[PDB]
Amino acid sequence: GDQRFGDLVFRQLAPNVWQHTSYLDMPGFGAVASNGLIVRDGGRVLVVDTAWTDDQTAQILNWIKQEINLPVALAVVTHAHQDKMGGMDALHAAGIATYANALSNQLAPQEGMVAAQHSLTFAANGWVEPATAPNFGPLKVFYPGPGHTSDNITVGIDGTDIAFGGCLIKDSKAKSLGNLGDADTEHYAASARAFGAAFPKASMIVMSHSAPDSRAAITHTARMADKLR
Ligand SMILES: [Zn+2]
Ligand SMILES: [Zn+2]
Predict the structure, then answer these.
(1) How many A from CA of 108 to the centre of ligand 1?
(2) N or C: lower Cβ tally within 10 Å for the chain?
(3) DSSP readout, 22-39?
């Protein structure tokens, strides 16, 4: 069951995987939830995405201390919007090594974000260049192409049935794709489908702005994105 911890919500998804959820008022849009992940890999913890703010991100680290009590080895963030990168300073203050797509780090200052310490680069086929993602353990990072943003990346968790689409993917009952302000409308559908094809065995799809769903999230997202073209 969901665990309320201050103003955040935590939900266990698998033996070594939890979803973190944080909220920000977007005047004219309500209090918007954003989800990320926490993964235990043996004696360390790996984080996918910050919360919206530094204070919320420090609360994620407090939850980790209380519920797991192992060091956070690294964090990876999935694009340069506030829901994913807004808490970078809290990670740095905590001594955590941080990673983002090189393009996300380039875009960070103009988006009002602090860049991660390290830049991921990607092969032509979308898989991360392994030397840029050292010690990522079960995290398999994939650039699916431009969609929600030009820089969006995705993460599979090896040894689980879980893949994280970030803000690229919405659930199977969603009426829209959400914030398309920085989207690549021409390529979105193909990028959504490429995410699915990269993680074919993932039966639980986690995403930023919907609760976890089946792979119908991917097909429905792509079918909605077909209409942008
Ligand atoms: Zn975004
Ligand atoms: Zn988002």
Answers:
(1) 12
(2) N
(3) EEEEETTTEEEEEEEEEE
